[PDB]
């Protein structure tokens, strides 16, 4: 019932349209840290602690 | 009875006049046409139709 049929006289028949879509995404921020003292390094048994 | 007879004393006698006529003519516009489809040419038995 929706086939674009055409007669020998043509005319303004079977017009169509188009569409488009948009996608999006965003970034975020992360981080963490730790703290220490000089003694916690110098007097510790393991010299490879850091 | 209407001859321009002139006497020995002349005078204001036998005066005449003249006339002219104007002719005219105009032009007119004519025309006619016919239509046809592509199928009436391509699918017709006779290729010399046009």
Interface test with A, best of B37, B42, B43, B44 (most A CBs within 10 A): B37
Give the contacts of B45 (CB within 8 A, at least 6 positions apart): none
Nearest to A40 by CA among A31, A32, A29, A49: A49
For A42, phi then psi, to 5°, come to -70, -45
Using an 8 Å CB-CB cutoff, list chain A residues near B39. Answer: 8
For residue B9, CA distances in Å to A13, B6, B12, B13, B47 come to 100, 8, 10, 11, 94
Residue identified by tokens 């390094």 is A41
Give the contacts of A40 (CB within 8 A, at least 6 positions apart): A49
Identify how the structure was determined.
Answer: cryo-EM
With beta carbons less than 8 A apart as the criterion, state whether B38 and A8 touch. Answer: yes
Which A residues 9-48 touch B at CB under 8 Å?
9
DSSP state of A48: T
With beta carbons less than 8 A apart as the criterion, state whether B9 and B16 touch. Answer: no
Instruction: Please state, in angstroms and rounded to a whole number, the distance separating the CA atoms of residues A41 and A31.
Output: 24
| Region for B8 from its dihedrals, namely left if φ exceeds 0, alpha if ψ lies in -120 to 50, beta otherwise | alpha
Helix (H) or strand (E) holding A42, with range, is helix A38-42
The structure tokens listed for B1 are: 């009875």
Give the contacts of A31 (CB within 8 A, at least 6 positions apart): none
With beta carbons less than 8 A apart as the criterion, state whether B44 and B38 touch. Answer: no
Using an 8 Å CB-CB cutoff, list chain B residues near A9. Answer: 37
């Amino acid at each position: 019932s929706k086939l674009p049929l055409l007669t020998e006289n043509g005319g303004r028949v079977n017009r169509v349209g188009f569409t488009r879509i948009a996608r999006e995404g965003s970034i975020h921020k992360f981080g963490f840290f730790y703290e220490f003292t000089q003694e916690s390094i110098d007097f510790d048994s393991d010299d490879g602690l850091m």
